[PDB]
């Protein structure tokens, strides 16, 4: 995020980091319950990738984090490779996330909900802070 | 490097898809929602993460970071997967699995 600020640690408890088999962060995601994570289809997640929950500082070794294996990947079959439309993938975890103060779920909307233009919302992550 | 070790956040406004087409034209589809163009931008490594809005005292997942400016320009809106357009598929997957 460019021109964002540091979050209060643990205040976005559904935020996860996706790491490849080498340990490299490559995408974010969101816990929607103890067994499932939702992320983007364009991330190309596979069952060799790992879901990291409870993290604040990627350079710290004193935080209580969880490294969760992925049992199955459910890429929306309507994802369009060219237009990037329908950009969603679900991850069914091998072993459940242990919910705590820093690890918990986001709510999901209904398909009929309206989130009006001009509403102030929030985005979070570990992306670059400058191009 | 420009990689933050610590989790970042930013507040930003939702756009209507029609106003998002001012920036992105025919690239904006039904299962997309735009946010930003207000001085902040999602950028490389943010992909897949959340766009959340507060409703009834709680936070709801409205978007998933999907794609945006070539250079993370803060005057161009970011594009997110529109969760309302995809949540019936999510629910159907959860109910069957």
């Amino acid at each position: 995020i460019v021109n964002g600020e540091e979050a209060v640690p643990g205040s976005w408890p559904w935020q996860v980091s996706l790491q490849d088999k080498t340990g490299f962060h490559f995408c974010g995601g969101s816990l929607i319950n103890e067994n499932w994570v939702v992320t983007a289809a364009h991330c190309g997640v596979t069952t060799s990738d790992v879901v990291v929950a409870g993290e604040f500082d990627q350079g710290s070794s004193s935080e209580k984090i969880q490294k969760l294996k992925i049992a199955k990947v459910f890429k929306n079959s309507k994802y369009n490779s060219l237009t990037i439309n329908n950009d969603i993938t679900l991850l069914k975890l091998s072993t459940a996330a242990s919910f705590s103060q820093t690890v918990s779920a986001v709510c999901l909307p209904s398909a009929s909900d309206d989130f009006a233009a001009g509403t102030t919302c929030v985005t979070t992550g570990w992306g670059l802070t400058r191009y | 490097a420009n990689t933050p070790d610590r989790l970042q956040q930013a507040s930003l406004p939702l756009l209507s898809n029609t106003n998002c087409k001012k920036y992105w034209g025919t690239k904006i589809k039904d299962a997309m929602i735009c946010a930003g163009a207000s001085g902040v931008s999602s950028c490389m490594g943010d992909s897949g993460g959340p766009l959340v809005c507060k409703k009834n005292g709680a936070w709801t997942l409205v978007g998933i970071v999907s794609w945006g400016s070539s250079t993370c320009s803060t005057s161009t809106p970011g594009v997110y997967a529109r969760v309302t357009a995809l949540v019936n598929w999510v629910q159907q997957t959860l109910a069957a699995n």
Binding site: G10, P13, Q101, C107 | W59
Partner: peptide, 10 residues
């Protein structure tokens, strides 16, 4: 869901 035990400061 959706109610962090640690409230965010925005």
């Amino acid at each position: 869901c959706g109610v962090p035990a640690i409230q965010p400061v925005l």
